[PDB]
Design a protein around this ligand. Structure first.
Ligand SMILES: O=C(Nc1n[nH]c2cc(-c3ccc(O)cc3)ccc12)c1ccccc1
Length: 282
């Protein structure tokens, strides 16, 4: 009993559902996703209601879909492709990223104790692509609030895509057993203040994740000890196989004063320059 938006509506019979990927997300094939391409099958990700889903859950899912419509398309975000709103449960159809989240992608490509190995240029490129996605989201007045390698997805073509931009208990942990408070700006953590500046702080932690090839920030540090580290002005160590220039970029993202952090616009220009100058030879 949902209103149709014909621009975005895909007939239910065009969506071949497949195995679970993670609400609730399944892999699917869409036939004729594109009006000018009715015989093309596209691998997509379909977000839907779980079996014991509340009225708020359906309200959250609709809100994420409507937010994605307003933000519009960018290469370095997970883009809305369609929806099934008529004659069944709500399906929100988004881009599929076959190579998983950036933490998984990096860990799988660590040098031996893997199939593929990343160059220094490839790591800086990852950072540039996330910065570009975030600059686009910022330009649309979207504050992420949980920017982390876990919320960046990687496509078959190694494109970085920001996820969960459309959507706390400080002690709740991720699937992977990590504490999301470890990505949060002090003003977000202590004062509940979330800005593009607090997302730049999170981007600092994400740069550290990239240069540690999916390293875990503050391993073994519980929430109460993290709070004390932040109050003391502690900053994470420079990763090995990270230039002084990229470490100083991380430190600048971690400025105690939100106004003094670089913007995503600044980070994109600086990372553009650094990519050009960074070796792909190791
Ligand atoms: O999740 C995967 N792929 C995904 N491709 N696109 C996605 C989009 C989402 C998604 C979309 C909207 C949301 O609100 C939250 C998550 C989740 C997973 C994916 C994946 C998992 C394991 C191995 C390989 C791929």
């Amino acid at each position: 009993e949902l209103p149709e938006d014909p621009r975005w509506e895909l007939p239910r019979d065009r969506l071949v559902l497949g195995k679970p990927l993670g609400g609730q997300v399944v892999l699917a094939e869409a036939i004729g996703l594109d009006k000018d391409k009715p015989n093309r099958v596209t691998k997509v990700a379909v977000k839907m209601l779980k079996s014991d889903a509340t009225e708020k859950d359906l309200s959250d899912l609709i809100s994420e879909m409507e937010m994605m419509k307003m933000i519009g398309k960018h290469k370095n975000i997970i883009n809305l492709l369609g929806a099934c709103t008529q004659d069944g449960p709500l399906y929100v159809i988004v881009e599929y990223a076959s190579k998983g989240n950036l933490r998984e992608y990096l860990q799988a490509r660590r040098p031996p104790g893997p199939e593929e190995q990343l160059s220094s240029k490839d790591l800086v490129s990852c950072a540039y692509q996330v910065a570009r996605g975030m600059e686009y989201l910022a330009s649309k007045k979207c504050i992420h609030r949980d920017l982390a390698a876990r919320n960046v997805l990687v496509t078959e073509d190694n494109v970085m895509k920001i996820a969960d931009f459309g959507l706390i208990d400080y002690y709740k942990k991720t699937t992977n057993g990590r504490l999301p408070v470890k990505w949060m700006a002090p003003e977000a953590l202590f004062d509940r203040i979330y800005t593009h500046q607090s997302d730049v702080w999170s981007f600092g932690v994400l740069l550290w994740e990239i240069f540690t090839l999916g390293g875990s920030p503050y391993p073994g540090v519980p929430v109460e000890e993290l709070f004390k580290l932040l109050k003391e002005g502690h900053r994470m160590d420079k990763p090995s196989n990270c230039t002084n220039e990229l470490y100083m970029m991380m430190r600048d993202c971690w400025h105690a004063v939100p106004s003094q952090r670089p913007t995503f616009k600044q980070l994109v220009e600086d990372l553009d320059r650094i990519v050009a100058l960074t070796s792909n030879q190791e």
